[model samples]
Target: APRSVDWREKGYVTPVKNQGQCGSCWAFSATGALEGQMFRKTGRLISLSEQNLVDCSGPQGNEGCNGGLMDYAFQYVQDNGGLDSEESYPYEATEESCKYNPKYSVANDTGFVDIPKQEKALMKAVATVGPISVAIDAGHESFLFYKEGIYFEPDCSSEDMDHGVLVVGYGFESTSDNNKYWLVKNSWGEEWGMGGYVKMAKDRRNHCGIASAASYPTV
Candidate 1:
């Protein structure tokens, strides 16, 4: 296995996005996994719509902006045949009625695979399978002001996983202190946390449940 892998540098990751005041991080996380598969196979990075899932996936148990699960969103995407492009559907960061159009669809998933609930498996998944969708507790105050450096909060609860994100890579930061970090992409836009990303402490007893709900889509 490779010691380090960063999908963003390989052009397999998309730009950072903002979820606004909505609790739709699950939708963003889902699209990110799908986007990675799309890029891996097609060599083209297309930003999928979180708005589509936020609206149409309610039938699959996704609770709109009130919060949802990534696996259920993947099920909804498979059922919908595909998800429309971000340019067509766009994101309102607010819940709304479903208005999906198949014509504007840019990517589709045959299904998804759930990674084992362990950091070692999660690392291999990200290294070979591209970005993996993960759920974590983001209720801690320090997670808000995160600028740069590995984010490891002892207060971050793994059992109360809330926010969803994408683990794009894992490696030591500048080989500094020999500490391993998971390179994660966030939906909080470019101005937040290392330009819409964060380096999280890895192999630390699944901190924040980073590997608990991890998975990715298959094209």
Candidate 2:
């Protein structure tokens, strides 16, 4: 394995986006993973539509804007003949009617895989795959105000994962005792964290349940 890997530096990551007040972080995380795989396959960074999943995937078990899971969202994309582009579908941040225009479809994920709850397996998946969708316990106040540095909440729950995010890569930072960190992409817009990104405690007992629900779409 490489010492560090960052999909952003490789042009696989899109700009930071916002989910607003809606509980559509799952859609964002789903799109983020698919977008990375799309880039890896096509060599183009195209933004997939979270709104498409938000408005359309409920029948497939996603709860629209209220809450959802990335795995089910991927299944929706696969069953719907692929997902449309953000430019075509756009993001309303609300549970609107499903207006997915298949004519504007830009990417397709054949399937997805859920990594084991173990952190080692999650790390291997991230190293091999481009990016991955992960759920974390973002129920803490400090998580909302996170800026820079490796985030770690000792009291964070592993099974009660509530918020969804993307694991773009993993690296080692010597600036702190917890040297290993996972480079995570957030859906709270560019003004949050490191331009809508955060480094979480990697190999720190899977802090915040970072690896508890990790999964990724296959191109």
Candidate 3:
């Protein structure tokens, strides 16, 4: 039987924005995931600002967008309330002001909830919830390329996959040239795909524990 998930039960539906060239993938991932949660809970797709987390998530790793953890970012949000919209906050790939707004602020926490290990949890989260926040090993080429499809590096030596993206939906496509694949959304802007989205082999590992997925629950 095809698995069923109650998205409304999870709460919120927010469109994710890509943080290009910035190592703030963790910030984007955390905010994007929670944006969906907040939307489902509030029935409003408010564009939460990512700069809040990027600039404030405490001091765990590198600063100025080098790398960090999504879990940490999530904790930051929980403690400092939620994020703001790009309109109110705007993204410049650099740390900026908090510009705290009572309307956007929400409760923040640092607890890590237990999640399923395989794609089962991911599938369940996406099906039952809105969009999901995930990190993928964009490798090196993904950082520079502008196209989409199952991406793989033929000459990349570093196994470190450094990037983040949202999984809006999944499906299969069969044609004369390709088989089935998973449709993924990106933040590189609308010029990337059928408007900033791409497809990849469903069974292939996306790396970065992108394979490691998480979703937000209605607050």
Candidate 4:
């Protein structure tokens, strides 16, 4: 029952990147989880290509720059051989043609893990494994303007998942309300929300079923 784990501090998490104007939040989320696994398995922190999936995974039910599913992205990586580095196939915010060339690939995953829809289970996963890829309904105002403090979104739900983000780890904070939170990572550059990160309220209804649809890549 490992708890209160923060992979970001353990050198497992990589620097945050931006996912500009594109609805490619899914790509970032997928890479975030994948990068963590690659770090754990290879002892090498490598930044994988999100744009590779964005541009080439249309046949797998993904709409580049429009939106996508993380599971599909993981499958796309497996099917297409492996993932390239950001130095090879860098991100292009807008839609583009699939310029996939696996010769530049540096890593790949065997599959992914779909965690149970339980906060305790998710906590254990992060404590023992690595970060988890999660979904949230970013239709709330507080979520949009979230800057500091443990974000307590009492109105978040398990429907209409509008955005994708990564959960690096979890730990409680003695907020004014004394609520615990999940330390989440974002791909909106360092200019957005707590240095491109957000602390979503946990131990208080899972705050948007983050655990419900949560999953992570495995190497």
TM-score per candidate, chains pooled: 0.97, 0.98, 0.75, 0.96
Per-candidate total of colliding backbone pairs: 0, 0, 15, 0
- Model 2 lDDT, full chain set: 0.91
Residue-by-residue lDDT tens digits, candidate 3, 1-219: 133332323444344366777877767666666666666566676666677777776653435477777667666665655555656666778766546564755433444443464465666656666666665666655535647555444443223546656666565555435343444566666676656666644444433354554544335
Name the runs in model 4 displaced over 4 angstroms: 175-177
Candidate lDDT (C-alpha), each = 0.91, 0.91, 0.58, 0.86
Candidate 4, 1-219: lDDT as tens digits: 554778988888889999989989999999999989888998988898888989898888899888999989988888887889888999888888888777899889777789898888888888888988998878889888888878776678866678889999888775366667889999989888999899888887777777878898778
Residue 197 miss distance in model 4 (angstroms): 0.8
Output the TM-score of candidate 3: 0.75
**Could you give candidate 1's per-residue lDDT for residues 1-219 as a string of tens digits?**
699999989998889999999989999999999999999999999999999999999888999999999999899989989899999999998899998999999998888899998999998898889989999888888898999988889887767898999999998866555388999999999999998999999988899889888988878
The 10-residue segment of model 2 with minimum total lDDT is 172-181
Query: What 10-residue stretch in candidate 3 is worst by lDDT?
Result: 1-10
Candidate 4 displacement at residue 98 in angstroms: 1.2
78-147 in candidate 2: lDDT tens per residue?
Answer: 9999899999999988898999887999999898999999888888888888889999999999999999
Q: What is the lDDT of residue 184 in candidate 4?
A: 93
Q: What is the lDDT of residue 54 in candidate 1?
A: 98
Question: Model 3: how far is 200 from its true place, Å?
Answer: 2.5
Best-fitting candidate, measured by TM-score? 2
